[PDB]
């Protein structure tokens, strides 16, 4: 269901990682590109990223694995369920809603904290009516589309 040029675009991205052209992405080539953009992953973080898509076990990403990952993104059944389960952790009533204030609170205080401009863009992307509640189930449907 991927067009021939849609594949050529993912191949171009893969080739940016695969600089030597041996058809694989190692932690070296993944981290080199990340740090060229100003990011600083640890070696362990690079191993975890590759292990998520390495279906062979040799510690590399080949183009078939890369292509499938780019095509799926977040649009799978398991992603929709687990992201919904993440929002539920901050659902006190178990009603599928969370106040925009509580959502802003957890996003800017837990984990990889969002900046003020990031969480502001997230709240604007959801809709608020009445008691300041957002229907996060329709919010994860929007992200996983």
């Amino acid at each position: 269901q991927l067009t021939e040029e849609q594949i050529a675009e993912f191949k171009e991205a893969f080739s940016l990682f695969d600089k030597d052209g041996d058809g694989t992405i190692t932690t070296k080539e993944l981290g080199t590109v990340m740090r060229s953009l100003g990011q600083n992953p640890t070696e362990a973080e690079l191993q975890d990223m590759i292990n998520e898509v390495d279906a062979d076990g040799n510690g590399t990403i080949d183009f078939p694995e890369f292509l499938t990952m780019m095509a799926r993104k977040m649009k799978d059944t398991d992603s929709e369920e687990e992201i919904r389960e993440a929002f539920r952790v901050f659902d006190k009533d178990g009603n599928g809603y969370i106040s925009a204030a509580e959502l802003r609170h957890v996003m800017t205080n837990l984990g990889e904290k969002l900046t003020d401009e990031e969480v502001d863009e997230m709240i604007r992307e959801a809709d608020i009516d009445g008691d300041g509640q957002v229907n996060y189930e329709e919010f994860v449907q929007m992200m996983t589309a």
Binding site: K73, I83, A86, V106, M107, L110, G111, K113
Partner: peptide, 15 residues
Amino acid sequence: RMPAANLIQAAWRLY
């Protein structure tokens, strides 16, 4: 609660 926030944050940043 920390890994749940990390998942939401990574999902939103991807979107």
